[PDB]
């Protein structure tokens, strides 16, 4: 008795949970990669220490993947329109939260590695700021899991 | 930002209108009017099929010509001081034009799939004909846009290769691999278009 | 242009009466006299300006 | 019954006219003021 | 309920009624409204109707024109962004 | 008290204008002149038995205008005094 | 990302290729080793004739002079740049004009110095650097009047916007010509940086570092040179361009600086400047901070060619070929004065 | 039988096949004319050789004209929606291909007209790039003919 | 039968045939006038000979006028939607083709006259390039005549 | 019977006929006025000759007014939809043609005035160019007259 | 019976006539006042003579007021849709023509006042050009009056 | 049985999977390739190592091809609307995720190759960053396979 | 009984809360991180103190998370459309108010840490301005609670 | 009786009252923060005295909060559509008025504090201008209260 077009919203839930987390992580890896290279032309020994922002950006894509896999496993042909809306909400709330966290990680990582070449003391501050940025994707994940496992 | 203000204003106004209209339809219980089924079903399959063919060739040519001028500007500029460029760096032009060749081949293949119906009630048009229309449109978009991006990419890489050749003759044969990798994307688009229209028959 | 300016002047005088000194005239209480004193100061300044 | 036709005629004619007015007025508004031959004294 | 101006067999009036075989009858129902299910007393329910913002022909025209307008805007962007040299050689 | 001569001149001119205009306005309201009906504070229930009910309010507004004119006359006197000091 | 690869070559592809062709001609390290070993200026001409320069010098008189060689090299650079400018389009044309403004800012100082000393402008025009020559006739027949020259500059010269840091012709009479030159250059450099950032894309990302280094070296060297002069700290601080990475509190600690050791202390906070200062021994017989800054500038310009779709390559080419002209002039000077011991002090390019 | 409005799409095919080809040819002619004007002042004797890109832009315009004339003669009153949309397809096929080919001709012709002045050996190279830039419009015309004669 | 709103496309065909031709001609006249003003300061004798680009920019407007007058004289009340579309198509094919031709004329005229100030030999080349840019309006006229007289 | 909404297109025809002609005349007057003002600083003698561009621009506004008056005079409540579309077409054809003509007049008038200060010989050519830029308004007026009186 | 929403277009005519005329007057006053402010620093005594552009700009707001008040007093509950359209058309025809006249007045006044600072003889020509700029708003008023009283 | 239009969304799933993955691969190859070419003149021996970002970009096109082939093989004319939505979801979740991976790969490849030309020791760090950027395409592929094979 | 699209506005409430609060927190963190990275070069000991703007940016994401979890817990299959509108309002309030708070905190923190590099006494003023900029998120949270628990 | 979508406009009034007011206050606090920080480098003693623009920005958010809480409390299930429109109007009137007041307070705060750094006499003038900018938000609040209570 449910609409056959109900599953469209759940499909977009999974699609957003992956696409937007991937875009956020791509930006976080790209800005951080340009920063790491422009830093490494002068201070090669800081490469592996400065790879941290890239990893924290990748964790955003992992959040997106976990939520997208959860939504995908939750999809069915008879899924109620309510559940489909829940899954679209979870998908957006993880994907765009990860997008924001990825922008923050990208800018912070670029600036932080560039500075850490100039000021070694800045490393811990950069790491703390990056943890704060990552926690935004984590909050997106928590909301998405609540919605998708109602 | 002159013309980009016009573009952005049209885009933003359109999507604000769409958000407001969607909210209004949903809220007023008028969702039953927003028949995407009726749209996709009454919009004639011929529209989708012929847009597919037209784009299949035209976007491929917009790719080929785009790459051709991107790389030809560099070929000529570097050839002013290094005339040896002209004969060798023509391979980038060949790779850009192969994209338009994919375009014509797939446009002809897709146009071979169109047939008249003599039926206008959607139940009479049928799943096969509607699928033929949508799949030819999908093949057109696939081949056309894959070829557009492939031609632009190969043009950029060919320009880079021509400028590199301007300063070291031995460099071309090694940068050509990047153009080959770029060119493979057009072949992938062609494969996907063929598979999209693998089981299509209007009638 | 004659009529254009005449209409502009007439309507501006009408509004500057009917929403300044009309305020003090259209009040029930007798303090409306002091209200008229102040409102008329405002009316005079605005009309001159 | 002609609602589709009249609606689209009005909507798109008015969109065209509005865009024409906005573009023409933008060009006039951001017209090069021409007194650049005077500016450098005033600045 | 369903409302529709001129549910009629005349081509001049929408031709919502139709026959494939020629027939002797013709009909016209100006401002035809009907409801046969989920009826409530003497009142028609809210009215759906044929007169919509868009129709199939207008949709085909609008989408074809939108593709043509994208192509023309691309061409006009390229043409407008043409430029002429401000200086010439000696 | 003291004030600038220009302020005093403005005060006396404003007082003269106010006195003349508001005396005339009070006169014209006490006359029950028709052209000023819209400014009378009457209410919709005052139109029952005859014009007297609204004549009374015309009189009230005329008294308000006269009071304002008296205030402006006092202001004019004070401004004339200020001018004399200056 | 601004995707300049899509639309750069529409208007600037030909010159993009041509300027790189020109860069391919700048002398290599091996070419400099060839020039280093010449016995005479004629021998230098012959060894040079095999390079891009070719027979540029063959038309001059037999008794070659290093002044003549310098003039010919400058003439060649000017010819090439004027060709590119004549074939440029509006945005690239504006960028090239910004490059020329730098030389205009010195030609204008020549003009004002001549006017305040009451000399005919026709005698000054020949001494102007061709890249920034005043084509406008409003700057001719000045009658040696500073007000006339100042109004001519404001009304008929691009430096009108830069002179707005000054306000009056009286400033020309009062302020020292070096302060005028450097204030104009600060205004020009900041305007150039803003222009490059507004161009954005690879142009910004590849050119802004060069102008930032220009600002930082300006700050360092102005500070180091100002110690033994009447120039006050309060006026010195105005000369620093605010584009460089020193801008907040670095320029401030320099304005507060009163000794070379304090300038070096400011430099210590930046790895890319710490290295230059440590390498610049500055004692007699070896590299000075000027030499180290020239080397770093050459490196920065060389890096401009690693990016493809951007205007920065034209500025990099102009400055690199200027460095190459000065290198050849230096080698000629060493050959002429028989000061072979220090002939290696040329800055190698590529 | 067929809908009243069926001819609109074929009409748009003809008008597009002409308009877009004209815009491509105009851009090509304008860019090549700017190139030729810049080139002439220094090397006057190359004007007539260098006018070739303008000829090829005119050829693009002629491709557009041929397709437009074909569609216009094919437009009957009772044109089936199928034929009408075939002709719309041909109109886009020739128009947009000619637009892109005209742009390419314009840019390469400008660059090559300038280059030939500094390096005459580049003349044949410019011509060889231009024929490749024009066979694209020829390809569009081939597909347009096939569609509009199907 | 011939719906009441059918005339709209024909009337817009006339309006386009005039408006876009007028805009093409106006751009051509404006750009070539700026070029001629710049050229005339140093080479006064060339001004009257150099008005050819303005003439060819004007002729685009005569093309537009001819098509617009033909459409306006070919408009009955109950015009079939087929013919209304044909006249819209003719109007566009001439108006926008004239717009492209006007852009070409403007660019080429400005460049060609400002060059002919420097090099007299450029004049015949400029005339040829202007003819090639002009015949685009003529191709538009041909297509418009076919469509509008069909 | 004629639809009640028919008069909308006629009133927009009149309003457009006036509005766009007014915008064109305003651009033509404004740019030519800045040109005259800049010229007058040095050559005050030429103000009354250089005013001509402004007269040309104003004639476009007069064309717009005449067409708008024809339409407004021809309006009625029962105006058949065909006549309403004809009036909209006339309004557009004169309004936007006058817009283009006024833009051309403004550009060429400014350029010609500034050049005439430098080179008096430019005046006759400026007159010719202004006439060619202005007859575009006359062509628009002719088309609008045909459509409106049809 | 006439439709209930008919008064909307008449009310929009009134509000548009006032709003766009006010925008034109505001732009004219802004630019003219900036011109007067720049002029004053050098030539104080011209300040009063140079207020004329502000006054001619205010004329346009007065014209908008005339049409707006006329339409507002002509509005009624049972206004026929035809009259509503007439009022909307008049309102726009005066409002946007006044906007164009305000642009013209602002630009011409700014440039002309700045010039008259440097050369007093310009004043007469500046007045003439401002008259030509304001007669555009006058024409808009004429069209609005013809439409409205019709 | 199933609706007429159901296969539309599956067709668009295939089209997105290929178009967006082609966009990502094309951008990655083009950006990294212009970086490589510009580098090579300075450091000819690094080209075969610097090809790695190009291969990583190509892998995005391979992901797109795999998902598109799966969709095109599973997509019959009368598939259930639920499967059609699933295939659209897989198409987007591979295409746009691969687009993000392509952007990351292009930026990282350009910057890292240019740095490695200047500092060899950046090579391994660049490889790690490229792996983290390319794995986003793998996540898109995982989500796409789950959706399309569900 | 209650509409099936009721839950859509509730899930948009939750996702909007989280997404927009996370974008505000991300912008604040990014701007503050750039500021800290610029400041730390001259004054390394300020890195730890200068993280206060990051903390107050994260608190905005915590507000968004709290409101999102409240809405998510309140969602159920049959919620009245009124309740769904309340939750949408709470989500928009908290999310966009936190977005504004994040913008303010980002700019204030960047400027404040950069200033505190130079004038240490600026820190207390920066903290107070941050508190003022942060109570905007608290007002958003208060309105969101009042709406969501109503 | 009342349509069940009636509370949507109530919730949007509340959300607008908070969101737009908070955006205005955030911009005001951001501009005042940059101004205060820039001034404080040279004039540290003014840091606390110069906090007034931030306070007058926060007052705008307080107006928004008051109106939003009023609407949220006055929003029942069967809210008449007319009263819901009243609450939407109140929300907009306070929110966008606070946005305007916040822009003015921010610009005036930046300018006034930067001036005060140089000229101590400007503080009282700045406060007067800020009060004038603030009374705009106060008018918005008054109109919002009238509408809400009506």
Curated annotation (Swiss-Prot), chains A, H, I, J, K, L, M, N:
Q: What's the stated role of this polypeptide?
A: Proton-conducting pore forming subunit of the V0 complex of vacuolar(H+)-ATPase (V-ATPase), a multisubunit enzyme composed of a peripheral complex (V1) that hydrolyzes ATP and a membrane integral complex (V0) that translocates protons. V-ATPase is responsible for acidifying and maintaining the pH of intracellular compartments and in some cell types, is targeted to the plasma membrane, where it is responsible for acidifying the extracellular environment.
Query: Lipid metabolism as a keyword?
Result: no
According to UniProt, the name of this protein is V-type proton ATPase 16 kDa proteolipid subunit c
* PTM characteristics: Ubiquitinated by RNF182, leading to its degradation via the ubiquitin-proteasome pathway.
What is one term from the GO cellular component aspect held by the record?
A: synaptic vesicle membrane
Q: Which residues lie on this side of the membrane: Cytoplasmic?
A: 29-50, 110-126
Task: Point out the gene that encodes the protein.
Answer: Atp6v0c
Q: For site (Essential for proton translocation), what residue positions does UniProt give? A: 134
Summarize the subunit comment: V-ATPase is a heteromultimeric enzyme made up of two complexes: the ATP-hydrolytic V1 complex and the proton translocation V0 complex. The V1 complex consists of three catalytic AB heterodimers that form a heterohexamer, three peripheral stalks each consisting of EG heterodimers, one central rotor including subunits D and F, and the regulatory subunits C and H. The proton translocation complex V0 consists of the proton transport subunit a, a ring of proteolipid subunits c9c'', rotary subunit d, subunits e and f, and the accessory subunits ATP6AP1/Ac45 and ATP6AP2/PRR.
All ranges on the Lumenal side of the membrane:
72-87, 148-150
Query: Among its keywords, does the record have Ubl conjugation?
Result: yes
Swiss-Prot record, chain C:
* Domain of life, per lineage: Eukaryota
Topological domain (Vacuolar) residues are 11-31
Q: Where in the cell is it found?
A: Cytoplasmic vesicle, Clathrin-coated vesicle membrane; Cytoplasmic vesicle, Secretory vesicle, Synaptic vesicle membrane; Melanosome
Q: What does this protein do?
A: Subunit of the V0 complex of vacuolar(H+)-ATPase (V-ATPase), a multisubunit enzyme composed of a peripheral complex (V1) that hydrolyzes ATP and a membrane integral complex (V0) that translocates protons. V-ATPase is responsible for the acidification of various organelles, such as lysosomes, endosomes, the trans-Golgi network, and secretory granules, including synaptic vesicles. In certain cell types, can be exported to the plasma membrane, where it is involved in the acidification of the extracellular environment. Required for assembly and activity of the vacuolar ATPase.
Q: Which family does it belong to?
A: Belongs to the V-ATPase 116 kDa subunit family.
Q: In its UniProt entry, what is this protein called? A: V-type proton ATPase 116 kDa subunit a 1
Give the organism, scientific name: Rattus norvegicus
Curated annotation (Swiss-Prot), chain D:
Q: Determine the domain of life of the protein's source.
A: Eukaryota
| Entry's transmembrane regions | 3-23
Q: Which residues lie on this side of the membrane: Cytoplasmic?
A: 24-43
Q: What is this protein called?
A: Renin receptor cytoplasmic fragment
Q: Which organism is it from?
A: Rattus norvegicus (Rat)
Q: Which gene encodes it?
A: Atp6ap2
Swiss-Prot record, chain E:
Q: Where in the cell is it found?
A: Endoplasmic reticulum membrane; Endoplasmic reticulum-Golgi intermediate compartment membrane; Cytoplasmic vesicle, Secretory vesicle, Synaptic vesicle membrane; Cytoplasmic vesicle, Clathrin-coated vesicle membrane
The post-translation modification note in this UniProt entry reads: N-glycosylated.
Reading the lineage from the top rank, the first entry is Eukaryota
Q: In which tissues is it expressed?
A: Expressed in brain (at protein level).
Question: For this UniProt entry, which segments traverse the membrane?
Answer: 52-72
* Glycan-bearing residues: 38
Similarity comment: Belongs to the vacuolar ATPase subunit S1 family.
Q: Briefly, what is this protein's role?
A: Accessory subunit of the proton-transporting vacuolar (V)-ATPase protein pump, which is required for luminal acidification of secretory vesicles. Guides the V-type ATPase into specialized subcellular compartments, such as neuroendocrine regulated secretory vesicles or the ruffled border of the osteoclast, thereby regulating its activity. Involved in membrane trafficking and Ca(2+)-dependent membrane fusion. May play a role in the assembly of the V-type ATPase complex.
Question: Which protein are we looking at?
Answer: V-type proton ATPase subunit S1
* Organism, scientific name: Rattus norvegicus
Please spell out the taxonomic lineage of the organism that makes this protein.
Eukaryota, Metazoa, Chordata, Craniata, Vertebrata
Q: Which gene encodes it?
A: Atp6ap1
Which residues of the parent chain are present? 362 to 451 of 463
């Amino acid at each position: 008795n449910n609409p056959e077009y109900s599953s469209f919203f759940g499909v977009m839930g999974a699609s957003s949970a992956m696409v937007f987390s991937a875009m956020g992580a791509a930006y976080g890896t790209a800005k951080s990669g340009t920063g790491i290279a422009a830093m490494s032309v002068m201070r090669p020994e800081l490469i592996m220490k400065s790879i941290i922002p890239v990893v924290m950006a990748g964790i955003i894509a992992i959040y997106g993947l976990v939520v997208a896999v959860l939504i995908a496993n939750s999809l069915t042909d008879g899924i109620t329109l309510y559940r489909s809306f829940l899954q679209l909400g979870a998908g957006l709330s993880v994907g765009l939260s990860g997008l924001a966290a990825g922008f923050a990680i990208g800018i912070v990582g670029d600036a932080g590695v560039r500075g850490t070449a100039q000021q070694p003391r800045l490393f811990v501050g950069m790491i703390l700021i990056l943890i704060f940025a990552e926690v935004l994707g984590l909050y997106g994940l928590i909301v998405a899991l609540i919605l998708s496992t109602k | 930002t002159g013309l980009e203000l016009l573009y952005l204003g049209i885009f933003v106004a359109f999507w604000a209108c769409m958000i407001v209209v969607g909210i209004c339809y949903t809220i007023f219980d008028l969702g039953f009017r927003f028949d995407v089924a009726w749209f996709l079903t009454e919009t004639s399959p011929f529209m989708w099929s012929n847009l597919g063919i037209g784009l299949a060739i035209s976007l491929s040519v917009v790719g080929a010509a785009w790459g051709i001028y991107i790389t030809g500007s560099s070929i000529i500029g570097g050839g002013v001081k290094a005339p040896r460029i002209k004969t060798k760096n023509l391979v980038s032009i060949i790779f850009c034009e192969a994209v338009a060749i994919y375009g014509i081949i797939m446009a002809i293949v897709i146009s071979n799939m169109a047939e008249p119906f003599s039926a206008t009630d959607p139940k009479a048009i049928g799943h096969r004909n509607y699928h033929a229309g949508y799949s030819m449109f999908g093949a057109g978009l696939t081949v056309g846009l894959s070829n557009l991006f492939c031609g632009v990419c190969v043009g950029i890489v060919g320009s880079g290769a021509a400028l590199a050749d301007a300063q070291n003759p031995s460099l071309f044969v090694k940068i050509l691999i990047v153009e080959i990798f770029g060119s493979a994307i057009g072949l992938f688009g062609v494969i996907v278009a063929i598979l999209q229209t693998s089981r299509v028959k209007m009638g | 242009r004659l009529w254009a300016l005449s209409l502009a002047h007439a309507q501006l005088s009408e509004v500057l009466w009917t929403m300044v000194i009309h305020i003090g005239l259209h009040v029930r209480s007798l303090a409306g006299g002091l209200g008229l004193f102040f409102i008329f100061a405002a009316f005079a300044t605005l009309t001159v300006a | 019954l002609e609602y589709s036709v009249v609606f689209n005629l009005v909507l798109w004619i008015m969109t065209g006219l509005a865009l024409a007015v906005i573009i023409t007025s933008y060009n006039i508004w951001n017209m090069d003021p021409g007194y650049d031959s005077i500016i450098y004294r005033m600045t | 309920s369903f409302h529709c101006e001129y549910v009629s067999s005349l081509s001049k009036k929408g031709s919502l009624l139709v026959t494939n075989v020629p027939s002797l009858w013709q009909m016209t129902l100006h401002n035809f409204q009907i409801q046969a299910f989920n009826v409530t007393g003497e009142q028609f329910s809210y009215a759906s109707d044929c007169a919509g913002f868009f129709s199939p022909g207008i949709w085909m025209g609008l989408l074809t024109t939108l593709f043509m307008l994208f192509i023309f805007t691309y061409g006009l962007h390229m043409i407008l962004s043409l430029k002429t040299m401000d200086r010439f050689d000696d | 008290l003291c004030c600038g001569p220009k302020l005093a001149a403005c005060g006396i001119v404003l007082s003269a204008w106010g006195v003349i205009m508001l005396i005339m306005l009070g006169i014209f309201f006490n006359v029950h002149s028709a052209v000023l009906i819209e400014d009378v504070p009457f209410t919709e229930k005052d139109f029952e038995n005859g014009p007297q009910n609204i004549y009374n309010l015309y009189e009230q507004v005329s008294y308000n205008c006269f009071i304002a004119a008296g205030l402006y006359l006092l202001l004019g006197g004070f401004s004339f005094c200020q001018v004399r000091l200056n | 990302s601004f995707f300049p690869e899509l639309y750069f070559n529409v208007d600037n592809g030909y010159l993009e290729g041509l300027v790189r062709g020109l860069k391919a001609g700048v002398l290599s390290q091996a070419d400099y080793l060839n020039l280093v070993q010449c016995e005479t200026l004629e021998d230098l001409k012959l060894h040079l004739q095999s390079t891009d320069y070719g027979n540029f010098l063959a038309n001059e008189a037999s008794p070659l002079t290093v002044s003549v060689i310098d003039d010919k090299l400058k003439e060649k650079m000017v010819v090439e740049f004027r060709h590119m400018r004549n074939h440029a389009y509006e945005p690239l044309a504006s960028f090239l004009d910004f490059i020329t403004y730098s030389y205009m800012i010195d030609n204008v100082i020549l003009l004002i110095t001549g006017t305040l000393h009451q000399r005919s402008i026709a005698e000054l025009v020949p001494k102007c650097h061709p890249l920034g020559s005043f084509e406008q006739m409003e700057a001719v027949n000045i009658a040696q009047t500073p007000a006339e020259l100042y109004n001519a500059i404001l009304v008929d010269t691009p430096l009108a916007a830069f002179f707005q840091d000054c306000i009056s012709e009286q400033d020309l009479d009062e302020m020292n010509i070096e302060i005028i030159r450097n204030t104009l250059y600060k205004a020009y450099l900041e305007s150039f940086y803003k222009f490059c950032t507004l161009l954005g894309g690879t142009t910004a990302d590849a050119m802004c570092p060069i102008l930032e280094f220009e600002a930082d070296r300006r700050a360092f060297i102005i500070t180091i040179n100002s110690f033994g002069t009447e120039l006050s700290k309060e006026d010195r601080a105005k000369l620093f361009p605010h584009c460089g990475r020193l801008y907040p509190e670095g320029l401030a600690q320099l304005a507060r600086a009163d000794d070379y050791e304090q300038v070096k202390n400011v430099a210590d906070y930046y790895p890319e400047y710490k290295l230059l200062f440590e390498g610049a021994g500055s004692n007699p017989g070896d590299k000075t901070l000027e030499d180290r800054f020239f080397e770093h500038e050459v490196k920065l310009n060389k890096l401009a060619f690693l990016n493809q779709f951007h205007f920065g390559v034209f500025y990099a080419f102009v400055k690199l070929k200027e460095q190459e002209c000065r290198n050849i002039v230096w080698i000629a000077e060493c050959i002429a004065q028989r000061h072979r011991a220090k002939i290696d002090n040329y800055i190698p390019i590529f």
